[PDB]
Each structure stands twice: as structure tokens, then as C-alpha cells.
Amino acid sequence: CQVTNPSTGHLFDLSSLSGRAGFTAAYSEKGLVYMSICGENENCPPGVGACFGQTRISVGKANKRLRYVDQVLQLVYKDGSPCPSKSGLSYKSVISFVCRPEAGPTNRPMLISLDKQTCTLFFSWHTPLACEQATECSVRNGSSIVDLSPLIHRTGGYEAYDESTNPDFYINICQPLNPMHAVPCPAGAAVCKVPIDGPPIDIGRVAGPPILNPIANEIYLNFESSTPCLADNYTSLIAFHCKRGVSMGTPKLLRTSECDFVFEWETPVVCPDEVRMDGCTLTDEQLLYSFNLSSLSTSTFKVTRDSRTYSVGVCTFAVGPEQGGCKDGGVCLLSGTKGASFGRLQSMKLDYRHQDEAVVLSYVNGDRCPPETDDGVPCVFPFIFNGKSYEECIIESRAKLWCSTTADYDRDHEWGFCRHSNSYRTSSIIFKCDEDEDIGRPQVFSEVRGCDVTFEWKTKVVCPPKKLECKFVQKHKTYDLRLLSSLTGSWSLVHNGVSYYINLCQKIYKGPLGCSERASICRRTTTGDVQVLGLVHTQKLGVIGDKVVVTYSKGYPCGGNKTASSVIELTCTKTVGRPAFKRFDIDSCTYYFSWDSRAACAVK
Ligand SMILES: *[C@@H]1O[C@H](CO)[C@@H](O)[C@H](O)[C@H]1NC(C)=O
Numbered sequence: 001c002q003v004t005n006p007s008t009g010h011l012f013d014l015s016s017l018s019g020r021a022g023f024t025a026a027y028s029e030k031g032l033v034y035m036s037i038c039g040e041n042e043n044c045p046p047g048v049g050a051c052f053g054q055t056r057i058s059v060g061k062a063n064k065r066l067r068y069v070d071q072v073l074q075l076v077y078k079d080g081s082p083c084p085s086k087s088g089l090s091y092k093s094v095i096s097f098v099c100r101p102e103a104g105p106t107n108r109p110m111l112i113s114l115d116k117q118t119c120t121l122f123f124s125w126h127t128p129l130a131c132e133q134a135t136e137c138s139v140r141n142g143s144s145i146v147d148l149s150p151l152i153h154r155t156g157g158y159e160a161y162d163e164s165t166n167p168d169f170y171i172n173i174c175q176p177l178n179p180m181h182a183v184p185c186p187a188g189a190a191v192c193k194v195p196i197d198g199p200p201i202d203i204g205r206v207a208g209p210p211i212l213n214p215i216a217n218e219i220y221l222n223f224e225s226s227t228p229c230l231a232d233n234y235t236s237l238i239a240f241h242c243k244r245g246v247s248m249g250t251p252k253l254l255r256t257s258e259c260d261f262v263f264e265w266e267t268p269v270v271c272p273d274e275v276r277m278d279g280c281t282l283t284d285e286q287l288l289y290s291f292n293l294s295s296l297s298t299s300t301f302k303v304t305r306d307s308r309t310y311s312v313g314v315c316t317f318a319v320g321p322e323q324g325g326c327k328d329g330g331v332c333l334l335s336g337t338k339g340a341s342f343g344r345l346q347s348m349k350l351d352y353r354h355q356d357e358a359v360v361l362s363y364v365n366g367d368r369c370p371p372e373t374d375d376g377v378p379c380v381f382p383f384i385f386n387g388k389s390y391e392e393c394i395i396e397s398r399a400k401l402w403c404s405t406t407a408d409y410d411r412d413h414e415w416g417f418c419r420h421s422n423s424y425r426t427s428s429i430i431f432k433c434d435e436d437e438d439i440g441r442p443q444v445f446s447e448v449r450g451c452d453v454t455f456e457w458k459t460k461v462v463c464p465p466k467k468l469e470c471k472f473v474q475k476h477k478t479y480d481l482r483l484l485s486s487l488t489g490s491w492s493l494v495h496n497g498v499s500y501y502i503n504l505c506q507k508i509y510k511g512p513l514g515c516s517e518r519a520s521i522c523r524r525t526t527t528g529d530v531q532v533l534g535l536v537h538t539q540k541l542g543v544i545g546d547k548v549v550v551t552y553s554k555g556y557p558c559g560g561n562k563t564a565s566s567v568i569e570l571t572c573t574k575t576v577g578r579p580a581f582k583r584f585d586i587d588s589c590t591y592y593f594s595w596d597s598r599a600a601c602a603v604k
């Protein structure tokens, strides 16, 4: 019940599998196959390794004859019962063992395909017991390693595009292809080709580790074949080009050079980790001041909803060296026994949300999102089935990978065949402004299909310019408006009984009730309510032909997402003048004010 390697002489032992009680594989829906390893199965006639379900049909007589075929441990069960094809022709089974380092509940035998012509049953079993070395899905780059491991497909395989709904190519990278429903890909294959017309041909086998280009750097990956070309053994190649973003990106076919297959894969994982331009601070061109989020980075936060507890870090890993769950992860859904990373801290992006005055931190590229059923109803992890708790799609009493849709299958019997996700998990915090939240505390805002999390965090950190500089430069000329910026009260013009209150670079002080805080320019209709015409923090300064212009946005609601605005223009004069009213542009909803001032005049 053992075989060794012709080139290394490594030991393989399948004694741990040699049960008399054996195991069960499925074919069709309610069809079953009972089988033992290196011995006859107690559910079959004496001297038979595997047989058909209800009707004990010998699909092969048991033996210890274990062949090693290219990284794969292969058994053959010969001289089974008569075959429908011709007289005396025996049924035969090919139980083949493919390597897989991870254990897990899907380490079980399966019919991958059935040749009806030659009565050959094709089986595959995925075991750590069949592994010889380690999974080499990384190559060293200078001081830090580059690691393709998260791209490893662990349930099936990547499907390559329909070039010049039917399948075509199949791909996994550092472990071989997983068993696939009605896809007769040969056991142990890494890269597979399915032709409409023709039994699927092996074109790629996981050769060595990824290789590194020391120049304008990309990453390659060689794949081999024992199956021969129609002009010469087929070769296969995946080139990796770095592309940042949410999608980890499937491989696509590029060149076809006939005895050679070349692919291309655009992926975040190949990108160098980039030290952030300006640390834990958000800076936008449009407002030119900035927020310092560092005071939050100071520690992690445990946010929780419906028993789901996330640990969240701002500019620091979600989990220190203690829970040790989400490697690299900046947000982490703690499941005690584990952790799911909802985005790599390194991938962090900070973007100002102009529409909302809010700041959006976003981590990306965590762990794969969970599967749903074929009919699109989400899986529930963990679930109980046959009195055991499962955390992933299983193959038990069924032909294809399936999950439960309740916490307790045994009780509720609801389920569906898994269709797997392709998005890896994202998270984001949206930072909203609140003056008396010194450092706030995030809460859960939205969760979608266990694939994204968004928190709302109200800090003081993302608020505070109520005071601004009036020293700016345009085309090498410096103007100093600090003269007109009153630290005590404001300026007021009365135009047509309507009072206007206006203060440069600063909050209006002792303003009329209705003039909010932050209000840079105000308006009070004779006996009517008052209207904010602009806010100080949205200040814009500039020069237009001899005039110094100052702009304020985000005033009162002006119909159809329009908001009031104020534009004050200043020609240079001798005095420190008073502001006057010019016009109110109806279409833009903008107020134009005149000011002759000594302030609008650069000097040296
Ligand atoms: C490897 O490391 C160097 C130095 O850190 C960096 O410039 C380069 O972009 C990295 N990328 C790869 C995958 O070679």
C-alpha cells in the first residue's frame, strides 16, 4: 500500500486510509460508490475495492498496485464486473491521489469523469498525505518576499476567456487543479484545455517556484506536461503584470505559439508595497488644508454587530501579535478560532468625499468573499451537518460542492450547490465630522454578503478649519488679506433693506441667530429668516486681471442640488474700504460682492 519516487526516493504511505469500512464517492444525484483503500470494501462482494451504490456492481477488484505518475499516486482496480460495451471486458477504476497541503472536509474521493466506451471510472482524491515538498508560491525580492499564495484556487479553477456560455481553459498556480463538476481535467494537472470535440488535454503541470525578473520587474511561472505536442511535450506560461485595485484579476490567454501556451495575469499581489506618500494624513488639491488621522492610529478598536466582532485599525494592523488572525489585515472579522482579513493595511487609500465633507479610508484585497448557492441565497458558516460543524462548502452525500443556508442543516435541511466568489474582501471607514468626539469610536454602517464592511466613525479629527490663512500667492505676487479678517464680529452691508454679514478667512462672530457656526458670509432679509451664503473652510483665493477674488461655497439649499455661493472681488485702492453688493446670478445661485481695499495690493 505504498510507492516511492523514481527521482528523489521519498516515502508515501496510505495506511491511514486503508479502512475496511472505507469511504463513499458520489456519481449522478442519488447514485453512490462504496470504496476502500488497499483492500476490499465491506459494502461490496468479497474481493472488490469499489462497487455501484444500491446494486453492488464491481467497478474493480482491490489491490496494492500503486503507480507513481508525475506527482500523482495512482491506483488501478482491475477485473471488475462485465462492461456494457463488449463481452469479457471488465470495469476498471483509476483512483488517483493529488496533493493538497491544507486538510479540510473536502479531502475525499470523487468521480471526475466516466469513459463509457472503455468502462473506465476516473477518480480523484486530494490529500496532504500525497505531498512531497512545500507549496512554493513565493519568490524573494531584494529584502522582502513576493507571494502568489492568495491567488491559489482552492475549490476549482480559474476559467480563461473565450477569445476569437461555454468553457475553454482552466488554471491554478502552485497547487494543482481541484476536482471540477463535469470537467474531465486529468488528475494533478495545473493548466487544462477543454476543446468542444475532444477529451480535455493536459497542457500544464506546476513545475518550479515563481521566477523573478531583476530588471523592469514582472513575475513568471513555468508549467510542464507529460502529454506530447503535435509537432514535437506541451508547455504553459503565466506572466504577471502588476495592477492595483479591488480585483485580484483572473488570467487571460495572450500568445498561442503553437507548441506553447502563454497567459497573462494582472494582479495586486505582484505590486510592490508602497510607503504612503504622506503617512496617515489625507491631502486634497481642492481644499489644500489637510486632516491628521494619526491620533486614531494609536490603537485598535473592537466594533461589533449581531455577534460579528471586527477589530479595526487606522494606519495600523487590525490585530497585534496576540490574536494573530488576519495577517496584514487592517480590518479583521474575529471568529476567535480564526480571522478573516477585510483588506490589507498596506493597500490603504484615503480619499476626500467632496459631496459630503467626509473622509474615506479604504483597505482592499483581504481573504476571498464567501460562496453563495446557485440560486443566490447566502451560505451560513458555521453549519451543523451529521452532528459536525463545518466552515466551508463540503462534498458529502452529493456530487458537487455544497453549503447549508441555515446554522443547522440537520434541523432545517436547506442548502444549495455552492457557486464561488471571485472578489476578495474589502473594507472602508467613512469619517464624518463631530467637534466633541476627541477621538471617536467607529460603528458598523453596512455589510454586504460578508464581502465588504463599512464603518462610520465620527471624530473631531476630520473637521476643523474655522480659521484660515489670508496669505496666498498668484504668479509670484503675495497678497495679505489679514487686514479684513476680523477676529471680533464681522462686516455688514445693508442692500435694499436686506442685511448682509461678511467676514474674510474667519467665522462670523456674534452672528445673527440662524447664521450657523463656520458661516463665512450671511444674509438676513428684513423680517425674514437668515441665510448662510458661504462657509469659511471652503475658501478659495485667486487673482483675475487686477482683481483679487475670494470665493465661498456651500450656502443655503438653492433647488436641484444647488447651494448658495458667494464671490467677493477686490480691486486695489488707497483705503481699507467697505464691502458693497454687486449682483446675484440666478442660474449659478451666486452672490457677487464689491470691495475696494488696501488689502488687495501686494507690497515689498
Ligand atoms: C522588488 O523590490 C524592489 C526594491 O524594493 C522594487 O523596486 C521592485 O518594484 C520590487 N518588485 C518586483 C516584483 O520585483
Ligand SMILES: *[C@@H]1O[C@H](CO)[C@@H](O)[C@H](O)[C@H]1NC(C)=O
Binding pocket: 225, 226, 227, 233
Ligand atoms: C516529455 O519531455 C521530457 C523532456 O523535455 C521527457 O523527459 C519526457 O519523457 C517526455 N514525455 C514523457 C513521456 O513524459
Ligand SMILES: *[C@@H]1O[C@H](CO)[C@@H](O)[C@H](O)[C@H]1NC(C)=O
Binding pocket: 281, 292, 293, 294, 295
Ligand atoms: C499627526 O499627529 C501625530 C501625533 O501622533 C504627529 O506625530 C504627526 O506629526 C501629525 N501629523 C502631521 C500633522 O503631519
Ligand SMILES: [Cl-]
Binding pocket: 107, 126, 127, 128, 129
Ligand atoms: Cl486526507
Ligand SMILES: [Cl-]
Binding pocket: 438, 439
Ligand atoms: Cl479621549
